[PDB]
Every structure is written in structure tokens, then in C-alpha cells.
Design an enzyme around this catalytic site. Structure first.
Site, PDB file in Angstrom:
ATOM      1  N   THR B  16      92.369  -2.085 -30.797  1.00 21.64           N
ATOM      2  CA  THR B  16      92.770  -2.394 -32.159  1.00 21.64           C
ATOM      3  C   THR B  16      94.116  -1.762 -32.391  1.00 21.64           C
ATOM      4  O   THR B  16      94.281  -0.533 -32.194  1.00 21.64           O
ATOM      5  CB  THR B  16      91.683  -1.840 -33.195  1.00 21.64           C
ATOM      6  OG1 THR B  16      90.411  -2.409 -32.937  1.00 21.64           O
ATOM      7  CG2 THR B  16      92.072  -2.203 -34.511  1.00 21.64           C
ATOM      8  N   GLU B 144      94.374  -1.445 -17.891  1.00 21.73           N
ATOM      9  CA  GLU B 144      93.965  -0.737 -19.107  1.00 21.73           C
ATOM     10  C   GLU B 144      92.461  -0.317 -19.092  1.00 21.73           C
ATOM     11  O   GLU B 144      91.917   0.111 -20.190  1.00 21.73           O
ATOM     12  CB  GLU B 144      94.250  -1.594 -20.347  1.00 21.73           C
ATOM     13  CG  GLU B 144      95.778  -1.734 -20.607  1.00 21.73           C
ATOM     14  CD  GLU B 144      96.121  -2.570 -21.828  1.00 21.73           C
ATOM     15  OE1 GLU B 144      95.322  -3.408 -22.237  1.00 21.73           O
ATOM     16  OE2 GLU B 144      97.159  -2.255 -22.465  1.00 21.73           O
ATOM     17  N   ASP B 259     101.467 -11.318 -22.187  1.00 21.63           N
ATOM     18  CA  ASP B 259     100.071 -11.725 -22.069  1.00 21.63           C
ATOM     19  C   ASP B 259      99.886 -13.176 -22.267  1.00 21.63           C
ATOM     20  O   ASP B 259      98.967 -13.744 -21.741  1.00 21.63           O
ATOM     21  CB  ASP B 259      99.183 -10.885 -23.009  1.00 21.63           C
ATOM     22  CG  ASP B 259      99.233  -9.404 -22.669  1.00 21.63           C
ATOM     23  OD1 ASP B 259      99.292  -9.067 -21.470  1.00 21.63           O
ATOM     24  OD2 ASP B 259      99.174  -8.501 -23.564  1.00 21.63           O
TER      25      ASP B 259
END
Ligand code: NA
Ligand code: NA
EC number: 2.7.1.15
Lengths: 318, 316
Positions: B16, B144, B259
Site C-alpha cells: 500500500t 520484493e 511494471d
């Protein structure tokens, strides 16, 4: 036929979501770092005060404005879980719920960015619906995390109905509207807020007495300057000599929110124990705030009546 | 009963984005008031997955978020984009991952990432997804989540003949060399290439040289992306670098554009396997370039219906 008590404590003020990232070191400009942990919490001075008053057993009503977003939906649920009336908790799509984003290192040094957001959209129309609830309350509590005009109008509404006003000028501003002094039955701030309000330096109880006298003479009935862990100093129109209400050194675990625990406790005593001396109420409120500093998590650290000594809720001097 | 088979599986991250705008960046001990706050859905894994889904891919997001509001809301975000959340796990043991950003008016920032629940996605969590992985066409990983987890996802894919697309982002200088040997397509940007190779990369030619270092470490195909300059591609069978351009567009917000490129490439690899790599990269460049013309990361990623029909046609 029996019915429930109406709200004796009304708080017109703020709700903020605390967004906390813990790191090893504080970043500087241009940097991206990985932190260790993230914490969300429910904050805002208004709500914090209200939650401490409620947990002591007060019947409370929170007048405030949050976003139509997940944060605001969640804040409403938080108020309900603490048995607070949300009759006048308003939601708006015109701004997000207020936020206090914090980055803190292992030494507790920090960088903080506040966006007041929906708090600033709480307006006069929003308050006017609460006129009857306000008029039947015992205490009205305001801070300076909403629009100042809106806090001024809530103190005005309280005073026109004979309701005791407890004003926390926090965070403080140097050009505070002087109507706030006149409209405050009890005016309560900390040392650094006193400095902002008066232009004086305040690093000891004696200094706080001098600063308190400046504020008293601007039209306050009672002035209290809190000294964090060290207790408080109080003076009044009736007894203008400053009085230091001292405390015993406790081991602090986390002091976040402790000032609001003090204020919310004082609100509870003013509403439900009106025959106690002011001095007695401050002693008890100091003790309660000191309970909150022995645990982490701001509102989560605020004690409940059932976990506190029985004598805090009884007569002592009479 | 009528399973939707996912053709694209992404094993990676959800974060987030928590963004405060200010006049100035605060320093230690300071409290300031900013003038706006906003929230966004990020994480390279989810971003990539979102873009592939909006092009019409049937996707499955293998990830871990918190049992918290952020996590519940992330799950809803994935569902609104038509992404399977069968293996979107929720844990009480950490919060949904967070990227807390403070940005001033000049656009300078301070950023604090807490990977959180993303790091708790483990090899057992993937084993429940064995069957879904084995029926997919493409598996997509980044850097990640815990590397060991990505390695195992690439291994599982490779064991079932499933194409592996690996994005080493953010990049680390001592990347485990298994990542080269497990990648069918290895895709990164200029500054990631510099980190991986120790070389400087300021031009398409420099990227070709860096791409060749990575190719020789065991990659089958290497693509180095160049932002508005397009990309450079090499492979074991055609090791000469080839510069694929992008036509010029006015940028509004480039966040997430990398992305978008990678999710587009995943879509083409899964649904248009007979297109030349050159034509895939043309189309993926165009798509990413669409995303930079609007603000808001995932909210900028175009849908199939917003794009030219020829992006979805193929000659014999
Ligand atoms: Na505490
Ligand atoms: Na964009």
C-alpha cells in the site's frame, strides 16, 4: 420508566489515523530505506480525549468529521467499540481522514507529517445538529486540530447553555483568537504550548507558574500547565497563586497520547465528580495519565475504570 | 465446475502506497503539516498482474498480505481487476506491506518501505499452488519477497515447462546467479542493469553491452528497458543487441510504467507465443507509454478496449 443517561461529555474535535514506520535510521532527502515494522493506530487529540473519558465510565459523544474512505469507516468502528456516540461523527468524500505519518528510529527520534484532511471540513451546520446534545451535557471539550472558528462556535454553544468548557489549545498558535480565553472555564496546555502562546520560556514548574499568570490575565477562569511526567501547575481567578501538583517518577514504556489521557480524565472528573476540589481532580488525572505511560499504543494504553484503584472513583477529602 | 485456468501466474508483492505532499521535506525531530494525503495500490507483483489482467489475461496472484484493513482492501482491488485471489494469503503475523512517501512541491521525496507480510510468503504457501502453476503459460517474479521464495516459484515453473519471466527489481549487486539460469526472459531497467553488472548505462549502446554481460551469466533472453527510449533486447540465439523504439508521448506520471511494460510482456508471452519478440516488445512499449499519460499507477494501466485493435491481432 428507566432510560440511559444522555451524554455528559461532548468532545468537538479531531480524529487522525496514525501511520507509523520503524527504521534503524531516519531517511534524508532523495533516500529510500527499508524499515523494520509498520503500525496503524487511532489518534487525533479529540478522539483520544474522548476515548479516555469513556473508558473511565463517561457517557460521551464525539462530534467530528472523517473521510468516506477505509480509514474513516474504521475510525467509526473504533469510536463504537469504545462505547462513544457517533450520532455527530460525519463522513465526507471531499477529503481523506486526517493522517499523522511518522517515521521513528530505535532511539525514538522521528519525522512527522500531519495532513488534517477531513477534520478541517467540520463546519457550523455540522455542529448546529448537536445543539440539543451539547445543551444537555456537563462538559464540552475542544482542541485546535479542527478549524479554530469551529472550536470557537462549540465553546460558544456550550457557554450559552451553561455547560462547562475545557479548552486544550493544542497544537498551539502564536496569534490565538482572544475569544478562546474568555470562553474557557478551564484552559489546559503543556509547556511548549504555553511558550508559543506567551512568548516566554518554560522549562520548570516556576516558569510555568509565570506563564500561567499571563494566560489567566487574558481572561481564563482556570489555567493548567502540564509538565509531562512531572505533574502540573494550576491557578485560577479565585486562587491566583500558582500551585505545583507533583508526581512520583514512574518508569515510562511509551508516553505517546499521555497528554490526552490527562485531558480526558479531567473531563470525566469535571462531568461526574463536580464536588471534588480542582486539586483533587488534577491529582487523580495525573495518576491516570501516568498509568497510560506504562504501556505502548496510545489509545490502547488508556486504562479502564475496572483496572484502576477503586479510590479514584470515590470521595477522599469529604 | 468450469475452472478458469490462469495463464499468467505472478508470485510476488503487494504494497500500500501512503503518500503525503508537503511544502518542504522534514528532518529529524520536525513536525510539519502537509497539504494532501493519498493512498494507492502498489507492489511490483500486483502492478504487473493488474496490467496483464486488463489486457484480457486470466491471472492468479500468489502473495501474502496482512489480516488488517489494508490487506482486506488489497484483496478487493485484485478482485475488481478480475484477478484470482485463491493464493492471496492473509496473516496475522505482520501488516500488509507499506511504502510511506513524503514528497515536496519540486517532486523530491523520502521513502520508507516495510515489506511486512510480503516477506512471510514461504515455500509451503507455494506448494498449494502447484497445480495452478503447472497449468499456466507464464510465471512472473520480482525481488520484493524473500528471494528463496521466488527461486522456488521459478523452479516449479521450469519443472512444468512454464515460461519464466524474472524482473530483478529492486536490483542487488550480489544477486544469486540462480536467477539468471532459471529465467527464460530477464527484464530490467538501466539503473538496475548498472547495479547488476557494475557498468554504466546511459544510452542504448551501453545497454546492449550490459545486456550481453547478463546474457552470458545464463539468461536465455535479456531485455533492458530505457524509459521513453524503448528497450534493447538480446537472446542466446540472436545475441546482437536490437533497439526497439517507442513513439514520443507527453508524460503525465511515469509511476508504475516499468511494471506496465513487464505485465504486458507477460500477457504476450502467454497469449501470443508465436509473435516475434520484436513485435511483443513494440506492443509492450506502446502499452507502458499509454500508462505514462495518466496519473495514479495501477489507475493509469490501459484496458484492451482503450488500445488499438492491432495490438490484439496476429498475421498467419
Ligand atoms: Na502509553
Ligand atoms: Na502513469
Amino acid at each position: 420508566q428507566w432510560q440511559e443517561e444522555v451524554a455528559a461529555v461532548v468532545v468537538v474535535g479531531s480524529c487522525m489515523t496514525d501511520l507509523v514506520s520503524l527504521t534503524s535510521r531516519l531517511p534524508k532527502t532523495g533516500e529510500t530505506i527499508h524499515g523494520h515494522k509498520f503500525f496503524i493506530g487511532f489518534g487525533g487529540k479529540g478522539a483520544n480525549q474522548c476515548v479516555q473519558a469513556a473508558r473511565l465510565g463517561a457517557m460521551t459523544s464525539m462530534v467530528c468529521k472523517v473521510g468516506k474512505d477505509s480509514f474513516g469507516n474504521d475510525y467509526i468502528e473504533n469510536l463504537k467499540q469504545n462505547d462513544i456516540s457517533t450520532e455527530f461523527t460525519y463522513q465526507t468524500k471531499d477529503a481523506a481522514t486526517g493522517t499523522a505519518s511518522i517515521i521513528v528510529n530505535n532511539e525514538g527520534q522521528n519525522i512527522i507529517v500531519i495532513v488534517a484532511g477531513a477534520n478541517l471540513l467540520l463546519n457550523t451546520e455540522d455542529l448546529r445538529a448537536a445543539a440539543n446534545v451539547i445543551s444537555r451535557a456537563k462538559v464540552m471539550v475542544c482542541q485546535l486540530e479542527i478549524t479554530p472558528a469551529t472550536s470557537l462556535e462549540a465553546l460558544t454553544m456550550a457557554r450559552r447553555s451553561g455547560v462547562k468548557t475545557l479548552f486544550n489549545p493544542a497544537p498551539a498558535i502564536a496569534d490565538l483568537d482572544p475569544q478562546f480565553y474568555t470562553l474557557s472555564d478551564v484552559f489546559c496546555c503543556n509547556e511548549s504550548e504555553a511558550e508559543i502562546l506567551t512568548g516566554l520560556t518554560v522549562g520548570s514548574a516556576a516558569d510555568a507558574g509565570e506563564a500561567a499568570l499571563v494566560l489567566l490575565k487574558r481572561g481564563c477562569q482556570v489555567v493548567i500547565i502540564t509538565l509531562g511526567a512531572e505533574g502540573c501547575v494550576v491557578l485560577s481567578q479565585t486562587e491566583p497563586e500558582p500551585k505545583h501538583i507533583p508526581t512520583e517518577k514512574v518508569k515510562a514504556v511509551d508516553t505517546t497520547g499521555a497528554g490526552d489521557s490527562f485531558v480526558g480524565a479531567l473531563a470525566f472528573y469535571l462531568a461526574y465528580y463536580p464536588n471534588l476540589s480542582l486539586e483533587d481532580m488534577l491529582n487523580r488525572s495525573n495518576f491516570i495519565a501516568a498509568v497510560s505511560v506504562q504501556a505502548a499504543g496510545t489509545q490502547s494504553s488508556y486504562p479502564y475504570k475496572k483496572d484502576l484503584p477503586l479510590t479514584l472513583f470515590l470521595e477522599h477529602h469529604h
